[PDB]
Design a binder for this molecule. Structure first.
Ligand code: 499
Length: 307
């Protein structure tokens, strides 16, 4: 492959595998929202990298697990897209594999992948309203109805991913983005496709604050790891502050691995203003034993998220 062209999921998958296994830009486009010109797709000529514009008064380039995310606009279609820039050395095929093989309203769509220099450019569905993190950072704690609305979208995305034996591995406010009529899950760089009922980790993956005790242990875990991460995300949304941060601030020792392993679940971090329904939902999400922890499908049936 020496040019940028429209192709199949298989073409994209073969292209992504060739990068991770080491002149003019090359790549595979899955959607006609991106317009190649004579097999080219150049920055400042066929696509413009425009600034993200958040509407908050109180408070930008978000950082993913393996690269920064920019706002891009196709010059021909005028389609706004997220463009994640990943150095080839840091490129994991899962950053394209999940979004290319699986399609759901609550999972960010992949438009195309372009290699130029030593950088992989991932064109995706844009969450122009920013992420849950920016909302929390500028407005403080989220109202219950906002938490319910977001949780429902996240839970439909997780229910779908888990049905397909996919562990996201990094469920947190910055990976849940606002779109005009929905909230969507982003960043599949740390995601894994399970082949057995238990996944045995090679390394320690995720954001420590939202990390389950079984992930910290490295003795094997499953999709239930994402359910706990959601519970930790729910505490951050309800209180405006991530769990562990108020009780155990980090200074000399930045690691939370010991605290979380000895003291999880962080039930003490649920605010007093929390409703009985919401409290029950957060408490079940954070269950220490993953076997006793509910599935995303089970959480969708909860009273707190239904009329
Ligand atoms: N890590 C990662 N992997 N893929 C994505 C991604 C796909 N579509 C997106 N849309 C929006 C944002 C985003 C996050 N924080 C923000 C703050 C302001 C404005 C926008 C954002 C990120 C993405 O992100």
């Amino acid at each position: 492959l020496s040019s940028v062209r429209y192709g199949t999921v298989e073409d994209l998958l073969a292209f992504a595998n060739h990068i991770s296994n080491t002149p003019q830009e090359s790549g595979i486009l899955l959607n006609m929202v991106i317009t190649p010109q004579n097999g080219r797709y150049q920055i400042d000529s066929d696509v413009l990298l425009i600034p993200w514009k958040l509407t908050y008064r109180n408070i930008f380039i978000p950082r993913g697990a393996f690269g920064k995310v920019y706002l891009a606009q196709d010059i021909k279609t005028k389609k706004r897209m997220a463009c994640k820039l990943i150095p080839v050395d840091q490129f994991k095929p899962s950053d394209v594999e999940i979004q290319a093989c699986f399609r759901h309203e609550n999972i960010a769509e992949l438009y195309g992948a372009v290699l130029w220099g030593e950088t992989v450019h991932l064109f995706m569905e844009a969450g122009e309203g920013g992420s849950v993190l920016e909302k929390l950072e500028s407005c403080g704690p989220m109202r219950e109805f906002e938490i319910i609305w977001v949780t429902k979208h996240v839970l439909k995305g997780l229910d779908f991913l888990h049905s397909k034996k996919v562990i996201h591995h990094d469920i947190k406010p910055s990976n849940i983005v606002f779109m005009s009529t929905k909230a969507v899950l982003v960043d599949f760089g740390l995601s894994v496709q399970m082949t057995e009922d238990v996944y045995f980790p090679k390394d320690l993956r995720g954001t420590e604050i939202y990390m389950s005790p079984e992930v910290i242990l490295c003795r094997g875990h499953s999709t239930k790891a994402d359910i706990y991460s959601l519970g930790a995300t729910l505490i951050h949304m309800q209180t405006g502050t991530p769990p562990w941060v108020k009780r155990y601030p980090r200074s000399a020792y930045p690691s939370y691995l010991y605290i979380i392993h000895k003291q999880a679940p962080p039930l003490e971090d649920i605010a007093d203003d929390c409703s009985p329904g919401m409290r029950e939902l957060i408490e079940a999400s954070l269950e220490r034993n993953p076997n006793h922890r509910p599935r995303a499908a089970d959480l969708l049936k909860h009273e707190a998220l239904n009329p």
